């Protein structure tokens, strides 16, 4: 990786993302991961929409 994060995340997973429009953590998952930027793309979780947001925004899930 061009840039190496803490925040270990893996194709499939979900994830809490942090959206950009509300700026509250919401389950996503992450369908993409750019490790150049150590930024991942994450689909959100029943609305539908995804976003490119860092590793480092990504948080931890409950029961998964
Ligand atoms: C991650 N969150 C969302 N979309 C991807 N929310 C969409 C609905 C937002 C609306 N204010 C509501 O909460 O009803």
Redesign the pocket.
């Given at each position: 990786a061009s840039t190496q994060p803490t925040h270990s995340w893996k194709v499939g997973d979900k994830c809490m993302?942090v959206?950009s429009?509300?700026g509250?953590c919401?389950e996503?998952e992450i369908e993409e991961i750019d490790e150049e930027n150590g930024t991942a793309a994450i689909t959100?979780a029943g609305?539908?929409?995804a976003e490119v947001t860092p590793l480092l925004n990504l948080k931890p899930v409950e029961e998964g």
């Open positions: 993302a959206w429009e509300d509250q919401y996503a959100f609305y539908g929409n």
